[model samples]
Target: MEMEKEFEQIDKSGSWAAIYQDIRHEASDFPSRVAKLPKNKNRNRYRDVSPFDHSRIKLHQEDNDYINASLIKMEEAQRSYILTQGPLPNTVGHFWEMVWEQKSRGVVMLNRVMEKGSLKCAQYWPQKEEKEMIFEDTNLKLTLISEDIKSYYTVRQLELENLTTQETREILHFHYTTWPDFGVPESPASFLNFLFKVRESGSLSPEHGPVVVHCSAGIGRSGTFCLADTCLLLMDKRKDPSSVDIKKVLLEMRKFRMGLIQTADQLRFSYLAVIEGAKFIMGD
Candidate 1:
């Protein structure tokens, strides 16, 4: 099939380098909306992290309304995702506020609280040892109901309550523990299994609000996950896995968030995962 040939070209030595260059060139044309807010530079977890102004998710109710988050919607695939950086000590309240405001059913975390001796993310959720975690700033309470830890990922069921409204809801947290920062998973099969588990919970469905996906920077691993999942969804719907253009899809996703699929290896891994997922979709 022509799709197989395309995959072959992508797999060949040095081909990914050209593709990476193309991605970079296209990204260069994107407007750096990072300058719109003088406050984001201060609020971002990392010095270089900031949401593009065009796609940045804005908070409505809070006085300090800046949060490094972006809403990415794929209409064709019926997927909406909030891509954001890991919460800092100060931004945890804003993070939950965003989740509550967005009405997101799930949070797909692709990185750990710490990686390689560096603090990558805050302990945003209630740990198993804790009875509940309260964010006084957001007036929110999170109580852990249950947790299921697997080899590669951990699943948690938690109760989210709004202190102001006295309303409560259940949120699922799918945490992939094995994904290294700025790297790909060990295998696409395990990654696909994790993806399917999230899908089964109806979190990724159109009926719910966008699922929040994040990593240390919320661009590299987060982007790769979204790109792979979006491509697989398109292939599943059309029943022609080869019909979708992976590069074109990534470009479209980048319109919502900047610098997705960061490194050449990450970009290559995205293709590999998509190809592996397409095979599954084809029942091959």
Candidate 2:
């Protein structure tokens, strides 16, 4: 139909913390599947940027595979990337309070697009002397290119909103039919040029390193994008027919990310996207 539209404003009510809590609770099974990664945990933690070193960066990983996720927790500053799933929750304002209390750095905002009329609700939010960067759209996918433009992380967009059964079915069909165009190839060399372009393009810039991706609930659409990117990366490394194991990667992703491809329909279409798409790319 006419894409149900709503206007939402960035205010205390639509704070980042509330949105994050709702995503964490809804997308992941909090206490059971997801647990905070110890403060000491570090993977290449020593890497440094201009203003900070590894000591200044706080990294946390969630052990829950189905909802497996990780993040850099900044006590006094806001970083470039944070992942969240689903709609903005009411509790987000509390997060702002805590962040302000600690006099944290960086800016935080509700990453999702605001619903129509949300702007009117902005007045209820806390008074942030600094403005947070809030995004209000379905394009949460990000691509990160390397310094030399040889490698990059390519994130894709995944959207699921008020989808009906019929709509889901249509999505499956569309995804399958459009497979080859989306770059699922049987051979590594087949998609090399495409990969090069993705890495070289302005869209995937190194400045946005380690891109964070999400969609509603951060499961279905988010999972698909991550899965697809991984597959592309794998094909780049191994060209042997036996070396490519798309299904294995997907399984591992589910084990960690939890609820990826949340619906049977989503799972099926995602499979088609990779399987059929690979076939098409190989032929080309």
Candidate 3:
């Protein structure tokens, strides 16, 4: 009962601001040398937000192996996620190459390709009317087969192919269309509903490669999603829901990536989501 009580307390009693600040600052100033490379300069959406070299995912493409993505593994939670930026138009080839080589089953996009009169992400995938979009550089092509438009999100069944080999694979594109520019979702219940939908396919399972999760910058919203997911998973893996320290879990995740949970509100939302998600896992 204490676990449930604490959850209510954190949600109702306004206890997250200071904790969020401390957790946000708890990280080593890790180097992102690869992201700083002259050739990779234009690849980053934001100059400051670069993936740390150590955990950054390297593309198996022929040459110029640089993409703004990180391989984040939560071993205890049995979660593997690639926290990355929404692909820039130029690096769209690298995006598919990352997915192709990594063997990720689904691409979790948390923001719109365009938002608030700005292009948040490149229109990398095919539009609803179009059958396919080809990336000549990576020798990869993605064909949109089905589109399920929901109020909060859009689910698209895509066929990813290797142009050279002509081998095809089914890729799920889970796009959460509701998040307002660097902000949290409308509600945790809605977020959980969408998350569970993705889980139904077992896309987050460790048997597959990391699920590529991204937003415009790939820090705040992406971190929130992974934090809530990993913690809920840790709770289920462990018996006590209260045993999961959301802050500690996030700190560990941040070591592998950079500038995760960008704002206090985002961190707070992660708590809200984890708490709500726990109820389902625990089946109160």
Candidate 4:
């Protein structure tokens, strides 16, 4: 109840505008760095989707390594995430290589295979009954073990194998099928349920490597998810949702990647999800 009241007060104060302005002001000073590199331009799936050089993930063994991926670390929450654009046909091998090298436990996909009659992301994983799919370029194999389909999301159990070393690890694929590109979810309840499902899998725990999160360009929806999750964890730890400065937290996250929380709608939805999650954490 107290949390709700505090949320109402903050909402009425019209503080979101100030927060948005502050983020824009800080973002204006960020240099494009690797994104502007002439050599890396063709490596990106879209013209606008490029990783900032400071936080960009580079492959050790591959030539022409740029793949529009960034590593975002939030030490305060003990969370590290790889935010990247959707895999292009040519970059699919590089994507799997990243998953292998990063040792990520899970992949969080927020967009569908296609959106708004456009191809938003490639079908990076193997099909349901397929035994295995190999990326010859990277010498990696992805095998589908099982799938649990839900109304709004699907969870798949996959086996990622390094063909040369013949080593393998289990990877979880959490795909949210309903979230629209450039829009919010149906409600915070559905979104939080999906989040808790991911949490229950222990993928977001500090014991494992960073989770890879992507939507088409990997900024709008992916950023919203990370922001909400971090803020809720902070509130749970502090036992006071009011104490968290959402704007400050976002700015800190943007340092590791450029242009997080793309739309005003996305920013607003982050606050809504954070407040809803705080209430659940507080037992209200």
lDDT of each: 0.83, 0.32, 0.84, 0.83
**TM-score for every candidate vs. truth?**
0.93, 0.37, 0.93, 0.91
Tens digits of per-residue lDDT for model 2, 1-284 = 10011002213244434433433344423232112334222211111201112112222213311121233232212222222332234313322222222222222121123333332112222123243222222111111121121232222222212112212100000011111322233343423333334344432233433333334344455565555555544544554533555445555444334455544434434444544445445543
Model 3, span 1-284: residue lDDT tens: 34456657767877767767777667757899889889888899999899988898988755788899998987777778999998887899889999999999999998877788889898888976476787988888888899999988899999999989989999999988887764566579888988999899878987788899999899988988888888887787776666778778888998888889987788767877887787777566
Cα deviation of 94, candidate 4, in Å: 0.5
Candidate with best lDDT: 3
RMSD of candidate 2 to the truth, in angstroms, is 19.5
**lDDT per residue as tens, model 1, 192-252:** 8899899999999878899999998899989988998998888888855568988888888
Look at candidate 2 and tell me the lDDT of residue 172: 6
* lDDT of prediction 2: 0.32
Worst 10 residues of 4 by lDDT: 1-10
Instruction: Give the per-residue Cα lDDT of candidate 2 at 115.
Output: 34
Candidate 2 residue 141 Cα shift, in angstroms, is: 20
By lDDT, is 1 or 3 better? 3
Where model 1 places Cα greater than 4 Å from the true spot, the runs are 1-3, 28-36
Question: How large an RMSD does model 1 have?
Answer: 2.0
Q: lDDT tens string, model 4, 54-130?
A: 78888767566666888988887778889988888888998989988888899999989888899987888988656
